[PDB]
Design a binder for this molecule. Structure first.
Ligand code: HEM
Ligand code: HEM
Ligand code: HEM
Ligand code: HEM
Ligand SMILES: COc1ccc(OCc2cccnc2)c(C=O)c1
Ligand SMILES: *Cc1cc(OC)ccc1OCc1cccnc1
Ligand SMILES: *Cc1cc(OC)ccc1OCc1cccnc1
Lengths: 141, 146, 141, 146
C-alpha cells in the first residue's frame, strides 16, 4: 500500500529516469540473468548475451509496463490485468524472481542516479516494485 | 562461497576502494529507512523518526562501521564464511532472534549502496560476484538457525 | 489481489466461524506462541499460559478485525488504517510474524472446519490473510 | 531437530494413524493449488488446470506417497536429518533449483493436512512438535545451498 508520499516520490523519480527507462529495464534484466542464473530458465528462446537485441527490446517492454503502472498507481490491478494473467496464470513465475528483478532494478537505478537516489526515493521505489510484483503474481480474474 | 578467480579478483579490486568509515552506516541506515520494522532492534540508538535523523544518527554510523568490518572479514575468508561468522550468527540468531530474511535484505541494501558509490564501475559481472558474497554472508549468519 | 472467487470463498468459510471468533482467534494465538516462541516477545506484560484470560480476550479482537476485514475486503487499507498504524508504525512487527499467525489461523480453521477447508478455500484464505498482513505491515499513513 | 521425549511420542503416535496412501498426495496437491507457481516444477504430471484436476491427478497422488515416505524417514532419524536427506538435497537444489522457501511451504501445507485430518487431536502442543520436524526437514533439504 503506497502512501501519498510514496506516490509522489515514485512519479518524481521515474519522471527523472525519463527517457532512460527502457535502457534501465534492459540493464536490470542483464543484471538479473548474470547474478541469478536460475532466472534464465524463463527465457529459453532468448539470446541472453550481453547487449543482445532481444534483452534490450524486452527491457523496453518491462519499462513501459512500469511507466504505465506509475501512471495508474491508484488502480494497478485493473491496469496490469493482462500482465498479471501472463505472469501468474500462464508462466507460473515463482514470486522469488520478482524480488530478484526488483532488486536488480533498484541496483540499476542506484548506479545511474548518484544525485537522485535518496533513501526516501529508494524506500518508495522499493514499495512500488513490491506492489507491482504482488499484482503480477496474483491471479485475480 | 564459490567465486571464480575473475570474481574473487574483481570483488577485491572494488572492496579496496570502499570507504570503511561510511558505507556500513549508509547500508544500515537505508535498511532502517526502507524496512522500518528493523528499527525495532535499535531503540537504544536514538532518533530514527525521519530519513534525515536515520542517515545522520551517530550510533547508526558507528554501528555500521562494525557491520562493514564483519563484511571485510568475510571477504578475507571467502572459503570459510560459516566459521568466520559463527560468533555473529550466535548473537543474531540465539540472542537477538533476528529473522534471517533480514540478513538477505541488509546484504542487498549493501549492494545498492555499492552501486550508488561506484556507478558504472559496478558492472553486472561485479554485481554478480558480490551477490555470491552477500548470500554467503547471510547464509553464514543464519547458520545457528540450521 | 483477491479474485471474485476468493472473496466468495473467504466470506463463506470465515462466515462459519461466527461466534467461535474469540475461541478460534485465541487458539491461533496459542498455537503461534507454542510453535514459534519468538512471537512472544511482542506481548511482554501478557499472561501467555494456556487458558490465559488475556490471550482469550486478545484472540477475540484479532478474530473480529478479520471479520471486519472480510466485510471491507474491497477497501482494506482504509478499514484497517488504525490497525496498520498500530502494527507497522507503533509496534514495528517484523513481517515474518504475520506469516506465522496466518499459518496458525489456517491450521485452526482446518482443525475445526473439515468440510469447509477444501483446497480452493484453503487457497483463498491464505491469499486473504497475506493481503491483510501486507496492509498491516505497510505504512501508508 | 530437538524433540523432547514427550514430543517424540506425540509425533510417533499421530503418525501411526496417518493414511500413508493419501496424506502425501493431499499435501503435494494442496501445495500446487495454494502456491500455483510450484506447478511449473510438475508439468509432466499432466492436467493441473483446476483445484479438482490437481487433487484428482494420479501422478500427484503417486508422487505424494514418495514425499510422505521421505518425511517418515526423517521422523526415524531426527538425529541425522541432514544426512538422511543428502541425496534429495542435491536433487532439489543442484538439479531442480527449487527456492528453499518452497520447502517451508510444503512442510506447512503438510501441517494443515494433519490438522484437517485429525481435527481436535492435532492440539497446539502436537503442532509445536511437528513444526520442528518439518522445519528440520526443510533445512536438511536446503543444506546443499548453504
Ligand atoms: C516488475 C516486474 C515485471 C514486469 C513489469 C514485467 C513485464 C513484462 C512484459 C511487459 C512482458 C511482455 C508481455 C507481452 O508480450 O504482452 C513480459 C513478459 C515476460 N515476463 Fe515479465 N515482467 C516482470 C517480471 C518478470 C519476472 C520476475 C520474470 C521471471 C523471471 C518474468 C518473465 C517473463 C517472461 C518469460 C515473459 C515472456 C517472454 C516472451 O516469451 O516474449 N517477468 N513481462
Ligand atoms: C547481514 C549482515 C549483518 C552483519 C554482517 C552484522 C554484523 C553485526 C556486528 C559485527 C555486530 C556487533 C557485534 C558486537 O560487537 O557484539 C552486530 C550487532 C547487532 N546487529 Fe547485526 N549484522 C548484520 C545484520 C543485522 C540485521 C539484519 C539486524 C536487524 C534487522 C541486525 C541487528 C543487530 C543488533 C540489534 C545488534 C546490536 C545490539 C546493540 O548493540 O544494541 N544485524 N551486527
Ligand atoms: C492476521 C493479522 C493480525 C490481525 C488481524 C491483528 C489484529 C490486532 C488487533 C485488532 C489488535 C487489538 C487492538 C485492540 O485492543 O483493540 C492488535 C494488537 C496487537 N497485535 Fe495484532 N494482529 C495481527 C497480527 C499480529 C502479529 C503477527 C503480531 C505479532 C506476532 C501482532 C502483535 C500485536 C500486539 C503486540 C498488539 C497489542 C496487544 C496489547 O498489548 O494489548 N499482531 N492486533
Ligand atoms: C519440503 C519437503 C520435500 C520433500 C520431503 C520432497 C521429497 C521428494 C522425493 C522423495 C522425491 C523423489 C526422489 C526420487 O525420485 O528419487 C522428490 C522429487 C521431486 N520434488 Fe520434492 N520434496 C520436497 C519439496 C519439494 C518442493 C517444495 C518442490 C517444488 C515445488 C519439489 C519438486 C520436486 C520435483 C520436480 C521432483 C521430481 C518429480 C518428477 O518430476 O518426477 N519438491 N521430492
Ligand atoms: C500497545 O499499544 C496499543 C496502542 C493502541 C491500541 O488500541 C487502539 C487502536 C489502535 C489502532 C487500531 N485499532 C485500535 C492498543 C490495543 O491493544 C494497543
Ligand atoms: C501496497 C503493497 C505493498 C507491498 O509490500 C510488500 C506488497 C503489495 C502491495 O499491494 C498490492 C496491491 C496494490 C494495488 C491494489 N491491490 C493490491
Ligand atoms: C492482493 C494481495 C495478495 C498478496 O499475496 C497473496 C499480498 C497482498 C495483497 O494485497 C494488498 C492490498 C490489498 C488492498 C489494497 N491495497 C493492497
Amino acid at each position: 500500500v503506497l502512501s501519498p508520499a510514496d506516490k509522489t516520490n515514485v512519479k518524481a523519480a521515474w519522471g527523472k529516469v525519463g527517457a532512460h527507462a527502457g535502457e534501465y529495464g534492459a540493464e536490470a534484466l542483464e543484471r538479473m540473468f548474470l547474478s541469478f542464473p536460475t532466472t534464465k530458465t524463463y527465457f529459453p528462446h532468448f539470446d541472453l548475451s550481453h547487449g543482445s537485441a532481444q534483452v534490450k527490446g524486452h527491457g523496453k517492454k518491462v519499462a513501459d509496463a512500469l511507466t504505465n503502472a506509475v501512471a495508474h498507481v491508484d488502480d494497478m490491478p485493473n491496469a496490469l490485468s493482462a500482465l498479471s494473467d501472463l505472469h501468474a496464470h500462464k508462466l507460473r513465475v515463482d514470486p522469488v524472481n520478482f524480488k530478484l528483478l526488483s532488486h536488480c532494478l533498484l541496483v540499476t537505478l542506484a548506479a545511474h542516479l548518484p544525485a537522485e537516489f535518496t533513501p526516501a526515493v529508494h524506500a518508495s521505489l522499493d514499495k512500488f516494485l513490491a506492489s507491482v510484483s504482488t499484482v503480477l503474481t496474483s491471479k485475480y480474474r | 562461497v564459490h567465486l571464480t578467480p575473475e570474481e574473487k579478483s574483481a570483488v577485491t579490486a572494488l572492496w579496496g576502494k570502499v570507504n570503511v568509515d561510511e558505507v556500513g552506516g549508509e547500508a544500515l541506515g537505508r535498511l532502517l529507512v526502507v524496512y522500518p520494522w528493523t528499527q525495532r532492534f535499535f531503540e537504544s540508538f536514538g532518533d530514527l523518526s525521519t530519513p534525515d535523523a536515520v542517515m545522520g544518527n551517530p550510533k547508526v554510523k558507528a554501528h555500521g562501521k562494525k557491520v562493514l568490518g564483519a563484511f571485510s572479514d568475510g571477504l578475507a575468508h571467502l572459503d570459510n564464511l560459516k566459521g568466520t561468522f559463527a560468533t555473529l550468527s550466535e548473537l543474531h540468531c540465539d540472542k537477538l532472534h533476528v529473522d534471517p530474511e533480514n540478513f538477505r535484505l541488509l546484504g542487498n541494501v549493501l549492494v545498492c549502496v555499492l552501486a550508488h558509490h561506484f556507478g558504472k564501475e559496478f558492472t553486472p559481472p561485479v554485481q554478480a560476484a558480490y551477490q555470491k558474497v552477500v548470500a554467503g554472508v547471510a547464509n553464514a549468519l543464519a547458520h545457528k538457525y540450521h
